């Protein structure tokens, strides 16, 4: 395995190592999910789009608009954004400014935490 | 179209719920119950 | 009586004088004889037949006697010969003055006013005639027709604002539309109108169909004849459009009438039973109005063009939205607005006249007027709407989602696989074969289909048979009152597993099942069930039998019914358990209990489930009551399927100078070797001519210029020019040692110069093909291609791919008496050797090893023979030491010492006589025993070169890892079977199986995607095909690829090859034309068919080819045959086809030829139709049986089963009498005329062949002798032309012969006694 690593390596320093980084991924983790959407940031949509249905099915939970705003590159990232925030905040703000107040964006993430939910009403 | 005992027409073996199909010569003398009432253990 | 008596009258053939042309004839046939009888097939056929449209209808066409019944009647007999696959056009090509006016009314009677003067019948055979038309632009007078129909100026029958958003769209259009207007001011006013007319003829015929498609009821009954025009009319869409030439300008036209939402909503496709094949014949035209095609280009659209072009409708959509409605939808993200579901929410609760206004800003209906009401329904304004701006899945996402199993909802779907009954008069949802495909996903698609269809109609034969046999009754349970050899009873079955889908798609990666089978059967059938190996495909059946015990079955009716058939799946062997439970030195079993570990195809599991959960459909897996077997050779399709979509996924990288000539289009001489830019300036022709004479001989239009003027020093390499001047260097061949016997094998077959040709084009880069008449040498010039290649690029590989072993086992026999070492030979396949050594994995693993051994040896003496010490053996590994520190120390000093000078001094120094005592020197001259030295050194180091290649087998024990080591290194020709190479293909590219070279034998007989497969047995390097060369030999002139069910030949043309077709789309061949097997006089039968075929010398000198054939005056006769008994052909089982008095008088030929002392063996018998070889066996059983004086003929088969065989004498049977059947495919007939080397003698009813046009250029010729048998019973030396030293007898007839052979066998047994026990 240690060959896959350097071989792994050898991918990061680039298509075919695109290929092996993909079949890295694919091997068959939420980091390594973030490591091939950001591959997905950087190689190459709609391919992209499965993979991320598959990070999305593998994790339902909020960087997942972020793996939709690949495909935008956007409002219609920024709209799976929005419906993975029905299906669950700033990130369908995001993916408004990607169709196109940080710090109550931050109490906002207190609440996005997982008398307390008095808090959250705060 | 059963072919279990749960379920003349059939044309089949058929034995509803439990008669006998093969010999067992049993000891046991049959239970009894008298017009309206009790199993006659006397 | 009627229509026969008319030809016989005014135009049937073999008749001297026949009365004028008369225009009555042809109004009474339409409509009496035609019309009546409701377009009777039958009818067609015999006025068809009778050569009505060559002899009556168009040479006697003109524009003043044209009408309906003349414009029909000529549109019949085309349609007819397209429905019968015989040449349609050649009458026109020969006399095509009126052609053009025939033309134009065709389409005036096609836009004809519905139910006017022209039917609606007759208006779909129009339909029909003009799809033919359009299918045949490669006809110069039909494309000079067609393509005013179908040019840019089409355009003009857009609606305005539509043509204007192109020109917008591709500005340079613009000029090109301008220049069109100008032109059209010359023309003069009828000139325009006629112009007009043409270029809006498509656009109209759409209009008639939407009105024809809209008066079909949605339940009340309807005519079939508009369902029947509707479903032609869709047929002819799908072929414009899968076109590149007619889509190019006529899909925007298509698009433009909104045909296809029309359909889709129309009452037609709701009728579940009247519009199930037009909706099927729907699915195929929307799958190519919406192909991933660039229109202009002819460039297939990269994933990328497709979402912009999705995207860029979206943004227009919202442009509109914003500026004139929808406000939310025009702000939203694509993504949010794009699907199905979100754009019914936008656009559905929106009014007609709303969805109208939206549809017109998009240039997609006129504008409606202020206050005005929309004419159209919301329906149909939604669905236009929705449907173009809605998210598609690509092409390939689609065929990732079909399962490679058919189910019971397509097997017995005879639109999609029709049974061998099909007559051609209904259209079928197939794709079709002929010259151009789109893209390579459209190619591979369609063969994908065909093939998926084709090898399941075969599959229904397997199911209907076995389970017809196992006579499934009624107990609500089933009961078997049959068995069956190739299905059991299920007698558990269990999913075991589904796997995870893959990241992205929506199927399991893998489901698995445990079936199990009680072998309560015959030992001979348990053996077969457990022969069962990984990746045989079984089928899994469901039956709830309808019928009570002891019902009777019935073949003739519906099988469904019958055995209460439910549901069909495939499966494929992973393997057999053990009594441990691991799947399956192999074990010996116990009870009659087997368990079997199967594959079920992960995309049909996820419908059936998500049918389960979503529906409440029962759960499939759960039913299964049968499992089905097949035949091994018979099973592939799953395989094939698979590896055809594994080529569709990948990039497909074929050389580029091959990618656009198997698409079909551009130049086809442009892979010519003349036009390749790598094109070899000097080339080594080695051992390819015998002298320099043959040499010259072989470049009759070059100059040759020698570079040495000695006569005794003239192998030779030419180099040709970039200029009719051939300049040939003689050179020596480098001496291989003091053996003279390891001088090399060499070349004796004086090749023509028209061989040379093909030789010379194999050798060099591009596309090469030869078309090789009977016995013109293929074989020889496959060889020495190869062995041309072998030495002239040492590096480079070649793969050889055949149709069958026997082509494997002729190229390797005379591969074997040429200069090519045995270790680099390879043959793979799934087999009796036939060769004289063994060129298999097995075979070629041995050898190394054998040889291995002979050549450690000789390392062994020959460190002896230097005096170095050591008792150990050497291995590959020692052998390799030995020869850098002891073998090249001692060369490199000595040719220090006498190359860096006198004759003495080259054997003085010289470093291994002792090696070589069992074998130097002639103390010549320096130079002589220089190089006698030099051959001395290679003579060694290619034993140590060999050792090198043969160390792999001391690091690979198993035989598998040595042949895998033969297959991906060490061989430089691999061979096998076009089959085989479809069926490895997954193996060899896993593998990393590398070749340069490509070369095909029987290429006319291999299926158009089984030629294209072995393109693709590699990976591609550094983004480029590493293929060099590919040479392809076959003869298209004799019989096709094998379709099973003939119907896919009649709609698809599926039987064409690749071969085929590229000499029909025009790639130059080279035509072999001098046989060496058989009689000059015989090969005139079939060397009409080809270009400038004639004989080699041998056969025009050697008096084995004069000798006449004993007790026969004539070398070849047709003798005719008629009825017997009152019977001529016979049927005593359907399609069994038999004649009695041809048969019973060929064996009576038969034993006549015995009892003069024939060889019987060197007699064959061939017919064409398995009815009459089986009765003709039948005769030869019961009259010849155990008779001493006769023989049995060396086969008695058809001529379909002859192919690639001969023999001297050969008994042919044609059989039929009442029609010609399918010999009149003038394939079957080179064939039949050509298995013959000596004698040939046919038995037929000549009058019946006669009649036939397609075959008159051979019957011409056998009617050119007596058409009954002349015997010379008394006798050979006798010559071919010499008038016969005995009685010359004519038999009259076959029981007369019969008579004959009886008398002369009865003297024969009073006279003789022969002894066999």
């Known amino acids: 395995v240690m060959t896959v690593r350097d071989f792994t390596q050898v991918f990061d320093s680039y298509e075919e190592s695109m290929i092996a980084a993909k079949m890295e991924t694919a091997s068959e983790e939420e980091e390594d999910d973030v490591d091939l959407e950001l591959r997905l940031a950087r190689f190459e949509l709609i391919s992209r789009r499965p993979l991320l249905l598959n990070s999305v099915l593998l994790r339902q939970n909020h960087h997942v608009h972020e793996w939709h705003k690949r495909v935008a590159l956007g409002r219609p990232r920024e709209i799976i954004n929005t419906y993975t925030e029905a299906v669950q905040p700033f990130k369908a703000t995001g993916k408004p400014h990607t169709l196109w107040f940080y710090e109550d964006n931050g109490q906002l993430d207190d609440a996005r935490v997982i008398a307390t939910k008095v808090n959250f009403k705060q | 179209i059963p072919r279990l005992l749960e379920d003349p027409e059939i044309h089949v073996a058929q034995y509803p719920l439990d008669m006998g199909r093969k010999k067992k010569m049993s000891n046991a003398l049959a239970i009894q119950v008298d017009s309206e009432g009790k199993i006659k253990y006397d | 009586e009627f229509v026969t008596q008319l030809a016989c009258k005014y135009w049937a053939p073999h008749i001297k004088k026949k009365s004028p042309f008369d225009i009555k004839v042809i109004e009474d046939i339409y409509e009496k004889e035609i019309v009546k009888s409701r377009f009777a097939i039958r009818k067609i056929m015999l006025l068809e037949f009778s050569q009505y449209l060559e002899n009556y209808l168009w040479m006697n066409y003109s524009p003043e006697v044209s009408s309906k019944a003349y414009l029909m009647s000529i549109c019949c007999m085309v349609n007819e010969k397209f429905r019968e696959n015989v040449p349609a056009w050649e009458i026109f090509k020969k006399k095509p003055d009126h052609f053009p006016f025939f033309f134009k009314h065709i389409l005036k009677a096609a836009l004809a006013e519905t139910d006017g003067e022209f039917s609606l019948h007759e208006q779909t055979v129009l339909l029909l005639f003009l799809d033919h038309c359009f299918n045949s632009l490669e006809v110069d007078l039909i494309r000079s027709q067609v393509q005013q129909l179908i040019s840019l100026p089409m355009w003009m029958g857009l609606q305005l604002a539509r043509l204007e958003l192109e020109l917008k769209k591709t500005p340079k259009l613009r000029k090109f539309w301008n220049l069109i207007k100008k032109n059209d001011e010359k023309m003069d006013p009828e000139a325009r109108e006629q112009a007009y007319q043409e270029r809006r003829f498509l656009s109209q015929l759409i209009q008639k169909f939407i009105s024809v498609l809209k008066s079909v009821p949605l339940s009340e009954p309807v005519t079939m004849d508009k369902v029947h025009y509707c479903e032609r009319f869709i047929e002819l869409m799908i072929d414009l459009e899968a076109l590149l030439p007619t889509r190019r300008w006529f899909n925007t036209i298509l698009d433009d009438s909104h045909l296809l939402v029309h359909c889709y909503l129309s009452n037609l496709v709701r009728r579940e039973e009247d519009g199930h094949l037009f909706s099927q014949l729907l699915d195929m035209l929307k799958f190519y109005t919406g192909f991933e095609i660039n229109d202009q280009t002819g460039n297939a659209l990269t994933e990328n063009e497709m979402t912009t072009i999705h995207y860029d409708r979206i943004t227009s959509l919202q442009r509109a939205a914003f500026a004139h409605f929808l406000y939310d939808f025009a702000l939203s993200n694509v993504a949010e607005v794009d699907t199905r579901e979100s754009l019914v929410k936008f656009f559905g609760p929106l009014s007609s006249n709303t969805l109208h206004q939206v549809a017109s800003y998009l240039c997609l209906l006129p504008t409606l007027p202020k206050n005005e009401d929309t004419t159209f329904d919301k329906e149909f304004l939604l669905e236009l709407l929705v449907s173009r701006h809605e998210r598609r899945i690509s092409q390939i996402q689609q065929l990732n989602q079909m399962p490679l199993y058919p189910t019971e909802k397509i097997i017995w779907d005879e639109n999609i696989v029709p049974t061998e009954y099909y007559s051609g008069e209904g259209c079928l949802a197939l794709p079709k074969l002929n010259l151009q495909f789109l893209t390579?996903?459209?190619?591979?698609?369609?063969?994908?289909?065909?093939?998926?269809?084709?090898?399941?109609?075969?599959?229904?034969?397997?199911?209907?048979?076995?389970?017809?046999?196992?006579?499934?009754?009624?107990?609500?349970?089933?009961?078997?009152?049959?068995?069956?050899?190739?299905?059991?009873?299920?007698?558990?079955?269990?999913?075991?597993?589904?796997?995870?889908?893959?990241?992205?798609?929506?199927?399991?990666?893998?489901?698995?099942?445990?079936?199990?089978?009680?072998?309560?059967?015959?030992?001979?059938?348990?053996?077969?069930?457990?022969?069962?190996?990984?990746?045989?495909?079984?089928?899994?059946?469901?039956?709830?039998?309808?019928?009570?015990?002891?019902?009777?079955?019935?073949?003739?009716?519906?099988?469904?019914?019958?055995?209460?058939?439910?549901?069909?799946?495939?499966?494929?062997?992973?393997?057999?358990?053990?009594?441990?439970?691991?799947?399956?030195?192999?074990?010996?079993?116990?009870?009659?209990?087997?368990?079997?570990?199967?594959?079920?195809?992960?995309?049909?599991?996820?419908?059936?489930?998500?049918?389960?959960?979503?529906?409440?459909?029962?759960?499939?897996?759960?039913?299964?009551?049968?499992?089905?077997?097949?035949?091994?050779?018979?099973?592939?399709?799953?395989?094939?399927?698979?590896?055809?979509?594994?080529?569709?996924?990948?990039?497909?990288?074929?050389?580029?100078?091959?990618?656009?000539?198997?698409?079909?289009?551009?130049?086809?001489?442009?892979?010519?070797?003349?036009?390749?830019?790598?094109?070899?300036?000097?080339?080594?022709?080695?051992?390819?001519?015998?002298?320099?004479?043959?040499?010259?001989?072989?470049?009759?239009?070059?100059?040759?210029?020698?570079?040495?003027?000695?006569?005794?020093?003239?192998?030779?390499?030419?180099?040709?020019?970039?200029?009719?001047?051939?300049?040939?260097?003689?050179?020596?061949?480098?001496?291989?040692?003091?053996?003279?016997?390891?001088?090399?094998?060499?070349?004796?077959?004086?090749?023509?110069?028209?061989?040379?040709?093909?030789?010379?084009?194999?050798?060099?880069?591009?596309?090469?093909?030869?078309?090789?008449?009977?016995?013109?040498?293929?074989?020889?010039?496959?060889?020495?291609?190869?062995?041309?290649?072998?030495?002239?690029?040492?590096?480079?590989?070649?793969?050889?791919?055949?149709?069958?072993?026997?082509?494997?086992?002729?190229?390797?026999?005379?591969?074997?008496?040429?200069?090519?070492?045995?270790?680099?030979?390879?043959?793979?396949?799934?087999?009796?050797?036939?060769?004289?050594?063994?060129?298999?994995?097995?075979?070629?693993?041995?050898?190394?090893?054998?040889?291995?051994?002979?050549?450690?040896?000789?390392?062994?003496?020959?460190?002896?023979?230097?005096?170095?010490?050591?008792?150990?053996?050497?291995?590959?590994?020692?052998?390799?030491?030995?020869?850098?520190?002891?073998?090249?120390?001692?060369?490199?000093?000595?040719?220090?010492?006498?190359?860096?000078?006198?004759?003495?001094?080259?054997?003085?120094?010289?470093?291994?006589?002792?090696?070589?005592?069992?074998?130097?020197?002639?103390?010549?001259?320096?130079?002589?025993?220089?190089?006698?030295?030099?051959?001395?050194?290679?003579?060694?180091?290619?034993?140590?070169?060999?050792?090198?290649?043969?160390?792999?087998?001391?690091?690979?024990?198993?035989?598998?890892?040595?042949?895998?080591?033969?297959?991906?290194?060490?061989?430089?020709?691999?061979?096998?079977?076009?089959?085989?190479?479809?069926?490895?293909?997954?193996?060899?590219?896993?593998?990393?199986?590398?070749?340069?070279?490509?070369?095909?034998?029987?290429?006319?007989?291999?299926?158009?995607?089984?030629?294209?497969?072995?393109?693709?047995?590699?990976?591609?390097?550094?983004?480029?095909?590493?293929?060099?060369?590919?040479?392809?030999?076959?003869?298209?002139?004799?019989?096709?690829?094998?379709?099973?069910?003939?119907?896919?030949?009649?709609?698809?043309?599926?039987?064409?090859?690749?071969?085929?077709?590229?000499?029909?789309?025009?790639?130059?061949?080279?035509?072999?034309?001098?046989?060496?097997?058989?009689?000059?006089?015989?090969?005139?039968?079939?060397?009409?068919?080809?270009?400038?075929?004639?004989?080699?010398?041998?056969?025009?000198?050697?008096?084995?080819?004069?000798?006449?054939?004993?007790?026969?005056?004539?070398?070849?006769?047709?003798?005719?045959?008629?009825?017997?008994?009152?019977?001529?052909?016979?049927?005593?089982?359907?399609?069994?086809?038999?004649?009695?008095?041809?048969?019973?008088?060929?064996?009576?030929?038969?034993?006549?030829?015995?009892?003069?002392?024939?060889?019987?063996?060197?007699?064959?018998?061939?017919?064409?139709?398995?009815?009459?070889?089986?009765?003709?066996?039948?005769?030869?059983?019961?009259?010849?049986?155990?008779?001493?004086?006769?023989?049995?003929?060396?086969?008695?088969?058809?001529?379909?089963?002859?192919?690639?065989?001969?023999?001297?004498?050969?008994?042919?049977?044609?059989?039929?009498?009442?029609?010609?059947?399918?010999?009149?495919?003038?394939?079957?007939?080179?064939?039949?005329?050509?298995?013959?080397?000596?004698?040939?003698?046919?038995?037929?009813?000549?009058?019946?062949?006669?009649?036939?046009?397609?075959?008159?250029?051979?019957?011409?010729?056998?009617?050119?002798?007596?058409?009954?048998?002349?015997?010379?019973?008394?006798?050979?030396?006798?010559?071919?032309?010499?008038?016969?030293?005995?009685?010359?007898?004519?038999?009259?007839?076959?029981?007369?012969?019969?008579?004959?052979?009886?008398?002369?066998?009865?003297?024969?047994?009073?006279?003789?006694?022969?002894?066999?026990?």
């Open chain 3, 440 to 1317: 390579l996903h459209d190619y591979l698609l369609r063969n994908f289909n065909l093939f998926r269809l084709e090898s399941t109609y075969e599959i229904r034969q397997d199911i209907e048979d076995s389970v017809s046999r196992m006579k499934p009754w009624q107990s609500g349970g089933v009961v078997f009152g049959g068995w069956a050899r190739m299905a059991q009873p299920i007698v558990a079955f269990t999913v075991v597993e589904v796997a995870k889908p893959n990241i992205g798609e929506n199927w399991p990666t893998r489901v698995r099942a445990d079936v199990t089978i009680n072998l309560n059967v015959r030992d001979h059938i348990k053996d077969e069930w457990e022969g069962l190996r990984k990746h045989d495909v079984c089928f899994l059946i469901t039956v709830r039998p309808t019928k009570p015990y002891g019902t009777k079955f019935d073949r003739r009716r519906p099988f469904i019914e019958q055995v209460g058939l439910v549901y069909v799946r495939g499966c494929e062997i992973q393997g057999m358990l053990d009594d441990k439970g691991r799947v399956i030195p192999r074990p010996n079993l116990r009870g009659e209990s087997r368990t079997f570990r199967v594959f079920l195809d992960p995309n049909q599991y996820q419908q059936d489930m998500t049918n389960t959960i979503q529906n409440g459909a029962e759960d499939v897996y759960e039913t299964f009551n049968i499992i089905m077997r097949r035949k091994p050779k018979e099973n592939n399709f799953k395989a094939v399927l698979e590896t055809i979509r594994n080529l569709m996924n990948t990039d497909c990288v074929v050389p580029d100078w091959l990618h656009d000539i198997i698409l079909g289009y551009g130049d086809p001489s442009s892979a010519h070797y003349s036009k390749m830019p790598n094109q070899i300036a000097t080339l080594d022709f080695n051992d390819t001519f015998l002298s320099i004479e043959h040499l010259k001989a072989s470049f009759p239009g070059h100059n040759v210029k020698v570079t040495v003027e000695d006569p005794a020093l003239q192998p030779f390499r030419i180099t040709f020019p970039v200029a009719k001047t051939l300049i040939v260097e003689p050179h020596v061949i480098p001496n291989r040692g003091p053996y003279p016997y390891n001088q090399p094998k060499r070349n004796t077959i004086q090749f023509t110069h028209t061989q040379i040709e093909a030789i010379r084009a194999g050798m060099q880069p591009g596309l090469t093909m030869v078309v090789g008449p009977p016995g013109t040498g293929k074989t020889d010039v496959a060889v020495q291609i190869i062995s041309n290649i072998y030495h002239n690029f040492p590096e480079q590989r070649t793969l050889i791919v055949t149709h069958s072993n026997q082509a494997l086992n002729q190229l390797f026999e005379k591969i074997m008496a040429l200069d090519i070492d045995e270790r680099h030979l390879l043959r793979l396949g799934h087999e009796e050797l036939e060769t004289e050594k063994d060129f298999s994995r097995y075979g070629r693993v041995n050898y190394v090893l054998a040889r291995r051994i002979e050549l450690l040896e000789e390392v062994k003496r020959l460190q002896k023979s230097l005096g170095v010490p050591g008792d150990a053996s050497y291995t590959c590994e020692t052998a390799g030491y030995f020869f850098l520190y002891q073998v090249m120390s001692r060369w490199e000093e000595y040719i220090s010492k006498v190359k860096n000078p006198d004759v003495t001094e080259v054997s003085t120094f010289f470093p291994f006589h002792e090696y070589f005592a069992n074998a130097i020197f002639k103390g010549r001259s320096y130079e002589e025993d220089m190089e006698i030295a030099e051959g001395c050194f290679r003579h060694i180091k290619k034993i140590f070169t060999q050792l090198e290649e043969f160390r792999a087998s001391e690091l690979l024990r198993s035989g598998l890892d040595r042949s895998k080591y033969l297959l991906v290194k060490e061989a430089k020709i691999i061979a096998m079977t076009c089959t085989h190479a479809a069926l490895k293909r997954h193996d060899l590219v896993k593998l990393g199986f590398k070749y340069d070279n490509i070369l095909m034998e029987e290429a006319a007989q291999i299926l158009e995607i089984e030629t294209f497969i072995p393109l693709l047995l590699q990976n591609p390097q550094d983004g480029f095909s590493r293929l060099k060369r590919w040479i392809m030999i076959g003869d298209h002139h004799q019989l096709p690829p094998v379709i099973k069910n003939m119907a896919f030949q009649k709609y698809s043309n599926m039987e064409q090859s690749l071969f085929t077709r590229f000499v029909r789309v025009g790639v130059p061949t080279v035509d072999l034309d001098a046989q060496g097997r058989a009689r000059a006089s015989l090969c005139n039968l079939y060397n009409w068919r080809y270009k400038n075929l004639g004989n080699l010398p041998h056969v025009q000198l050697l008096p084995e080819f004069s000798t006449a054939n004993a007790g026969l005056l004539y070398d070849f006769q047709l003798i005719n045959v008629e009825d017997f008994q009152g019977v001529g052909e016979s049927e005593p089982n359907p399609y069994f086809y038999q004649n009695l008095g041809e048969a019973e008088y060929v064996v009576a030929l038969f034993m006549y030829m015995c009892l003069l002392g024939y060889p019987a063996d060197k007699i064959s018998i061939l017919t064409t139709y398995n009815g009459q070889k089986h009765l003709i066996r039948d005769i030869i059983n019961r009259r010849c049986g155990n008779n001493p004086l006769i023989g049995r003929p060396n086969k008695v088969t058809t001529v379909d089963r002859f192919q690639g065989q001969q023999n001297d004498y050969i008994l042919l049977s044609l059989v039929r009498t009442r029609a010609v059947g399918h010999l009149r495919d003038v394939r079957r007939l080179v064939v039949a005329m050509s298995r013959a080397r000596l004698g040939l003698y046919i038995f037929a009813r000549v009058s019946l062949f006669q009649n036939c046009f397609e075959l008159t250029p051979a019957f011409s010729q056998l009617t050119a002798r007596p058409l009954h048998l002349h015997i010379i019973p008394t006798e050979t030396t006798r010559k071919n032309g010499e008038r016969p030293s005995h009685e010359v007898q004519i038999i009259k007839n076959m029981p007369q012969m019969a008579n004959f052979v009886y008398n002369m066998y009865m003297h024969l047994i009073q006279t003789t006694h022969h002894y066999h026990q």
